[PDB]
């Protein structure tokens, strides 16, 4: 399977298929100490995955670009999804998202 369509679970750990989390441009930074281990079995997964773009949203909202290097081709995706402020679950989503972004600096 291609790297962009792999589902992570307790067999394929997030670091085992999406690469070790770090500060580099290609590598990602989400996950704190448990999402990288349980995966989609994380007990608070649906409330985070409700921000996951669908097939028509990723190619309908992102500023897609194509970069060509001697290494090969790369599709560059910048995006911005606004979170509402009226639904009560707002004060459920800011807590989760902050306690997982840029959490690779907190590992020992």
């Amino acid at each position, epitope marked *: 399977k291609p790297r962009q369509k792999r589902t992570a679970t*307790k*067999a394929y*750990n997030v670091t*085992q*298929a999406f*690469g070790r989390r770090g500060p*580099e441009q290609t*590598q990602g930074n989400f996950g704190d100490q448990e999402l990288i*281990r349980q995966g989609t079995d994380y007990k608070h997964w649906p409330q985070i995955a409700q921000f996951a773009p669908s097939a028509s949203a990723f190619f309908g909202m992102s500023r897609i670009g194509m970069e060509v290097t001697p290494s090969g081709t790369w599709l560059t995706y910048t995006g911005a999804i606004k979170l509402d402020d009226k639904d009560p679950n707002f004060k459920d989503q800011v807590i989760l998202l902050n306690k997982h972004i840029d959490a690779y600096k907190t590992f020992p």
Partner: antibody
Amino acid sequence: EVQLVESGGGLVQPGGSVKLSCLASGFTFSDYYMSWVRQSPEKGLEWVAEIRLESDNYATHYAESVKGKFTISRDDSKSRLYLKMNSLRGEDTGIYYCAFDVYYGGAMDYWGQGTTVTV
Amino acid sequence: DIQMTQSPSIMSASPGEKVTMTCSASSSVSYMHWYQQKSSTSPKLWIYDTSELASGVPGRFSGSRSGNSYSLTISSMEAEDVATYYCFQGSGYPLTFGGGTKLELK
């Protein structure tokens, strides 16, 4: 900080049973995996087995050639990893290492010192 | 289920030259981690996921993903690179190390 220390090895006659130890200090040992890696002067490095967290009922996973004759157990209170052996043949000669990874999975970065087992 | 074989057994080298080590993979290993062990010491990690250099490493080395075949390119040889080098899996549960390549000088 992280500093692994392993001991318990020694001379063992064929068919005997030994019990290596692996003590860790400086990190929450109850929240990481750990595996063993053997070394021989000829066959290089081979994978012994690994162990998983208390969440998955202390799940285990052993290699093929050493599927039997080995058992990894982990008591979390004293923060140690135990690798019990039985009926060691002539193939199990050399140095054994502990190894655990921070980013759970694959790349092992924090190694130990080494424990010498001779037949 | 999975068998891995490094191509060069004992490859010689000369200072400032180019070194190439090849590890095959008859499987679907996502990222091939890559270690190095010196004489009478503990093994250390040198390539994280098929491209990334490790922590505390010269920038000489670089990995590749030429299909199912993986390779390390050492730009220039130096006295600090005479050791054994191993390829390592970690996609499937039955983990398997390679055979090792011994880089000596000329």
